Amino acid sequence: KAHPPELKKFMDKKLSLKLNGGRHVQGILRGFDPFMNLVIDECVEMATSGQQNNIGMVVIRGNSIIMLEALERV
Amino acid sequence: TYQRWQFTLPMMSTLYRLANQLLTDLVDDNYFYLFDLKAFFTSKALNMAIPGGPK
Amino acid sequence: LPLNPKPFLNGLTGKPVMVKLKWGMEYKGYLVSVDGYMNMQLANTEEYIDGALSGHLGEVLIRCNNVLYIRGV
Amino acid sequence: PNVVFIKTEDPDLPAFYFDPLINPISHREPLPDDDEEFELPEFVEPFLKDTPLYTDNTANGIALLWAPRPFNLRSGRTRRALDIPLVKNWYREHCPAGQPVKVRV
Amino acid sequence: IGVPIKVLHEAEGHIVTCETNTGEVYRGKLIEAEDNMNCQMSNITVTYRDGRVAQLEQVYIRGSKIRFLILPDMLKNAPMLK
Amino acid sequence: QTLPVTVYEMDFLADLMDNSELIRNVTLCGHLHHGKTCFVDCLIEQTHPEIRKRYDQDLCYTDILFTEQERGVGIKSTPVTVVLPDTKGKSYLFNIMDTPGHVNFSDEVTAGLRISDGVVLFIDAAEGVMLNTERLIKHAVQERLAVTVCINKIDRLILELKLPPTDAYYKLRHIVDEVNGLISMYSTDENLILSPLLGNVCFSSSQYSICFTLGSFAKIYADTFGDINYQEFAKRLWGDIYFNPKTRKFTKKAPTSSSQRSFVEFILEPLYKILAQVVGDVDTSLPRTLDELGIHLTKEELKLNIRPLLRLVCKKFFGEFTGFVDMCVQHIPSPKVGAKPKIEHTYTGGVDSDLGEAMSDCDPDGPLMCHTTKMYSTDDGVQFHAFGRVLSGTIHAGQPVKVLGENYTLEDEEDSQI
Amino acid sequence: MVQPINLIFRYLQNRSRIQVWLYEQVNMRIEGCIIGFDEYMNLVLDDAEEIHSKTKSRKQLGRIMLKGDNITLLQSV
Amino acid sequence: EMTPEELQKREEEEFNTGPLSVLTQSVKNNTQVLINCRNNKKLLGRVKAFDRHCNMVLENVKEMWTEVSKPVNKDRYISKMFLRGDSVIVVLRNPLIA
Amino acid sequence: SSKMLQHIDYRMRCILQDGRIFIGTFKAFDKHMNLILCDCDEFRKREEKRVLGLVLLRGENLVSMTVEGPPPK
Amino acid sequence: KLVRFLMKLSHETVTIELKNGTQVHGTITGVDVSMNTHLKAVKMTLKNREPVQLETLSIRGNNIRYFILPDSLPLDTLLVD
Numbered sequence A: 001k002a003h004p005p006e007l008k009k010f011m012d013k014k015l016s017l018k019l020n021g022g023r024h025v026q027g028i029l030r031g032f033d034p035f036m037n038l039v040i041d042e043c044v045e046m047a048t049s050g051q052q053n054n055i056g057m058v059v060i061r062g063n064s065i066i067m068l069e070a071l072e073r074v
Numbered sequence B: 001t002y003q004r005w006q007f008t009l010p011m012m013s014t015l016y017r018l019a020n021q022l023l024t025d026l027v028d029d030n031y032f033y034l035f036d037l038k039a040f041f042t043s044k045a046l047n048m049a050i051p052g053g054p055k
Numbered sequence C: 001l002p003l004n005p006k007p008f009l010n011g012l013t014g015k016p017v018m019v020k021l022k023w024g025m026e027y028k029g030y031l032v033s034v035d036g037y038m039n040m041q042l043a044n045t046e047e048y049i050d051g052a053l054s055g056h057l058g059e060v061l062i063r064c065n066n067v068l069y070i071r072g073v
Numbered sequence D: 001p002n003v004v005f006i007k008t009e010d011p012d013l014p015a016f017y018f019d020p021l022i023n024p025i026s027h028r029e030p031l032p033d034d035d036e037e038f039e040l041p042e043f044v045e046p047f048l049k050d051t052p053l054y055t056d057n058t059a060n061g062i063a064l065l066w067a068p069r070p071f072n073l074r075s076g077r078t079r080r081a082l083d084i085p086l087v088k089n090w091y092r093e094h095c096p097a098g099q100p101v102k103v104r105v
Numbered sequence E: 001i002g003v004p005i006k007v008l009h010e011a012e013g014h015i016v017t018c019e020t021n022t023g024e025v026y027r028g029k030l031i032e033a034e035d036n037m038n039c040q041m042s043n044i045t046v047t048y049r050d051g052r053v054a055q056l057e058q059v060y061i062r063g064s065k066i067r068f069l070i071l072p073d074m075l076k077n078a079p080m081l082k
Numbered sequence F: 001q002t003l004p005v006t007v008y009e010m011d012f013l014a015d016l017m018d019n020s021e022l023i024r025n026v027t028l029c030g031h032l033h034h035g036k037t038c039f040v041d042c043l044i045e046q047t048h049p050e051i052r053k054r055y056d057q058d059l060c061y062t063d064i065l066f067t068e069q070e071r072g073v074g075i076k077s078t079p080v081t082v083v084l085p086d087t088k089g090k091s092y093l094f095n096i097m098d099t100p101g102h103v104n105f106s107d108e109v110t111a112g113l114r115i116s117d118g119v120v121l122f123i124d125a126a127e128g129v130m131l132n133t134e135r136l137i138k139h140a141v142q143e144r145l146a147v148t149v150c151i152n153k154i155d156r157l158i159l160e161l162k163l164p165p166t167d168a169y170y171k172l173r174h175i176v177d178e179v180n181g182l183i184s185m186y187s188t189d190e191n192l193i194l195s196p197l198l199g200n201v202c203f204s205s206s207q208y209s210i211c212f213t214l215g216s217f218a219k220i221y222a223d224t225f226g227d228i229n230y231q232e233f234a235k236r237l238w239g240d241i242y243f244n245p246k247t248r249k250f251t252k253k254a255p256t257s258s259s260q261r262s263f264v265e266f267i268l269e270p271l272y273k274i275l276a277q278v279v280g281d282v283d284t285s286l287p288r289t290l291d292e293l294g295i296h297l298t299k300e301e302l303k304l305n306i307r308p309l310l311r312l313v314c315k316k317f318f319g320e321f322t323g324f325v326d327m328c329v330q331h332i333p334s335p336k337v338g339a340k341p342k343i344e345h346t347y348t349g350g351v352d353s354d355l356g357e358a359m360s361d362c363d364p365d366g367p368l369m370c371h372t373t374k375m376y377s378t379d380d381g382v383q384f385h386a387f388g389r390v391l392s393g394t395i396h397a398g399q400p401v402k403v404l405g406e407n408y409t410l411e412d413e414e415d416s417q418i
Numbered sequence G: 001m002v003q004p005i006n007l008i009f010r011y012l013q014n015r016s017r018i019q020v021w022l023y024e025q026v027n028m029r030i031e032g033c034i035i036g037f038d039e040y041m042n043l044v045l046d047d048a049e050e051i052h053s054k055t056k057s058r059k060q061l062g063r064i065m066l067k068g069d070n071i072t073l074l075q076s077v
Numbered sequence H: 001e002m003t004p005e006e007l008q009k010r011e012e013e014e015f016n017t018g019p020l021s022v023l024t025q026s027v028k029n030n031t032q033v034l035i036n037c038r039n040n041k042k043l044l045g046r047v048k049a050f051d052r053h054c055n056m057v058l059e060n061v062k063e064m065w066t067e068v069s070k071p072v073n074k075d076r077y078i079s080k081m082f083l084r085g086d087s088v089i090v091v092l093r094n095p096l097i098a
Numbered sequence I: 001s002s003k004m005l006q007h008i009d010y011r012m013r014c015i016l017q018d019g020r021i022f023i024g025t026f027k028a029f030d031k032h033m034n035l036i037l038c039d040c041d042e043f044r045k046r047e048e049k050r051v052l053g054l055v056l057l058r059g060e061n062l063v064s065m066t067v068e069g070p071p072p073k
Numbered sequence J: 001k002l003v004r005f006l007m008k009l010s011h012e013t014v015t016i017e018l019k020n021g022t023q024v025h026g027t028i029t030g031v032d033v034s035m036n037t038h039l040k041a042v043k044m045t046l047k048n049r050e051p052v053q054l055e056t057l058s059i060r061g062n063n064i065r066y067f068i069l070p071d072s073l074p075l076d077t078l079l080v081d
Ligand SMILES: Nc1nc2c(ncn2[C@@H]2O[C@H](COP(=O)(O)OP(=O)(O)OP(=O)(O)O)[C@@H](O)[C@H]2O)c(=O)[nH]1
Pocket: D001, F031, F032, F033, F034, F035, F036, F037, F038, F039, F058, F072, F073, F074, F075, F099, F100, F101, F102, F152, F153, F154, F155, F156, F204, F205, F206, F207, F208
């Protein structure tokens, strides 16, 4: 009954995510599940301090996701 | 009073099979072309004669 | 060696461990029972508020929406 | 449009049969791959699979679909017996060939 | 499925404005919406909690963090609401 | 003003015209006698509760002249404006132009293709591709409109030819292949491949209210059994793909020699069984089938004749025509999107002019630009009403406007009036 | 494409230095080495350690079982 | 869930060998229970019954919370309560002081 | 759930989790307490009347509802 | 289920304290399976605000902290399935 989210429009694009405690992150979307857990390649950190830290291939749980922002035109 | 009737489909199939002599083998109104009531009324109003039709 | 958390909680039941909650307080006790829903029951535990002892309370049932994690020793 | 209905001459044939009166169809797409496996649930079946494709009353019911009035009905009113022309189709259709002159008149 | 989700699917293509749990107000044209409240929106004017006005052209809001949405006023003649 | 009873409010149709993304301009065409006006009748009966077909005659709601009623053919292309829901439940505004299919009235179609953006071509499943269908494919492609094809009269594969299921599938596939060939002969664009896999081809029977694509029949499966992604299940009900009942999967090879294709196994044989149990077995096994499909009929509804009962059973089963709305939304552009090739092809002076870029946005305020192509008479025949589309601006009742004729230029300024 | 549970399976194959973020806890993060998961994303860590943001005192945690309803980001190093 | 059966008596075997059995002794032996709940309150009383959602019924309870001035703990008596199960930190069987 | 079928078209007040006030005509509801309210006004505490219109409220942020006014004609 | 227990206690003057600290004194009318409580004769004392009178109240069942029942309720014959 759990329908997957239509994130086909945002595949392989540069998007910035907002997380719970005023947190911010960026990177390339690579896939999803029907629980909106997101895999992100080339993940740079970009906290509220102002310094940028690349990590790589990461997984964000969907419960702390606030908003998606497509920097590249989809 | 014997006014209305309704049957079943094998009954209608059998009564259609028995009556095959008094019926035509037509399927569509591509027959009677220029040989129906309206063409006969048109030939009536124009005072012409269809070949096979009335005068 | 794939060790899932469910045989971890159904295998080491009885060892003196410490659970740590969402509020930051810590319960030292040995695990009595645990279900598939991951509610937990531990006996004769002790209360550390930020590492500092507060008092004696007893044996504790802990619920899913209160726990942070479960570590050993 | 030309009704292309074909009459049934053998009761032992299936009702849906490729009659050789019909001209043959001269035989010869983005299909997805088998590995992205779409699995249906177990109790999902095609519709009406318990009923057969045809019964004994199917071809007769199709033949009565193109029958003249009243043989295409299944309910109606009774008519008084002098108001049923049994010969109206005969002189309404056409003249058969080879009839004498007085028959055409 | 109930009535408000069908009203949400009816408001696609028009201009709606949503406020989420982070106090941010996003106004613009709703593109897509599902049974759950995952809303894909475009041409977005953004009002933060402090008051900064931003322009974000592709936004995808998770339905869990949403407080509420504000719909157009001509949907009171929609068929499912009558 | 007085109006018949309609399932939607008229204020909703008044407020839906303001959004040019939810409007579609569609022209229905095809060869003579392939089922255009009866499909329009089915849409009108879908939108109006009080308009019903007679049990013996066709309705012909959009044949309003007496010449069309005495000849039985279409003479004048007639417009209609309705609001229809799709599969997902969203309401859409349709402007539908019914054009005649006779060849000598082909000028009635060219006046209809000027004021519209998409083409729906009706093809008889029994006869196939004919003369005027082949001419209208060329004429609709060269006028740069989107093309979708609906295959009407599929019950002539069932109740007239009495044709086997895989042979009817081969007939439908041969029709679709000939349509793809006639598309590819005149087009230079390779993205015009028509197939039911793309949601581009519909199947219909106008006489008994049958209309489905793959997605709508998959939605019927999803409403009957549940927990099935219908948009993914509809992607594998066409072509050489087979259901393997042991693994419950879709494989491209034959499990047995008696294995049928997926379109035959899941769609076409239930249609044969519904029509067969209505026609041949109304007396013995029809209540068992109607109890199995979840359809309840009144006892007076069971005593009808065979053709209205078959129309009633197919109308209770299939219901609203959501697949046609899905096709016309997915594959026919809105006038906000498709305004640029319309201005590029139909407006003198090119789209690169100053007014062409203003008309390419479909701006409801600004310069008023309208193009009237058709003239309709009243009941008395003393005055005419113009009929066209509004390219830009907003026209108002009582507004003084300027009428420009076909001999007008900027140099002359003679063929003009206020 | 990549789904996240196959990448968690790749993480337990690689036994990488997985740093986990937390829901509503912007300061306190945990380094660890993953072993196994479940259907609700409960995660065991072999050698976990605690790193704050204002204090930054690394304390030993050992093999922990961190729940699914607390985690935010599963990043490496 | 891989157990779709209608004869579902695992939730009371949950109440016997599982974690929730702590409450059942306080159903059967009728002991005193102490409850720490989400806005920092301490509820001491006697629970009658409960469910898998820990929706409990309590009787003859004293519940305390502190106020800040500087934090002083106040108490009040309630004869009978219904307590929703997501509104708790912990449930505590009080030990045998003797 | 006919107690909300009795509440149809009433001018009702709605209290959020943060303490704000949504006053609107009760048009539609569901099982997750998602509200369709037409001609809505927001009250917060300094008091101000903030006109909204047609509001789709999510059930996760609604605490309690009460009735203020009769349905208009 | 104890929530099915809660709909057997209609027309009783109980109080409800929610997760915001708001207290409601009133006669209970309707209980849903998700504990959606429909109340009448409402004395609503909100935390750090003034108590008010209300005629019909509708509390969503998630935000309930606890209930308080009067002294004269025989629950020993009401917890029978
Ligand atoms: N068997 C069958 N006959 C149909 C179907 N749809 C229409 N017809 C019949 O075919 C005849 C012509 O239908 P129309 O809809 O009038 O044909 P048309 O396409 O409007 O012809 P134009 O005037 O050229 O537009 C009528 O007798 C219809 O009842 C169908 O689905 N099946």
